[PDB]
Amino acid sequence: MKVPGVRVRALYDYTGQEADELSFKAGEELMKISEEDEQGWCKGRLLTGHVGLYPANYVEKVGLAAA
């Protein structure tokens, strides 16, 4: 266990930027699996096992309080 899925929720309903990106719904939950890029792009997996890039700038965690 080194990089578990990071649970995030989208603040709006968007569908990638090209055909290689993931599609999420407003309030849907996704699990990031890779790191963020210079364009705020993050690679992850949806709960359905779908893989691709998702706009990190359009989502936030839904884990615990900020502290």
Binding site: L11, Q17, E18, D20, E21, D37, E38, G40, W41, N57
Partner: peptide, 15 residues
Amino acid sequence: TKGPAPNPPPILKVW
């Protein structure tokens, strides 16, 4: 990066 993202974000920031 792979491709030029939808970025910058749309809203929910400045409050």
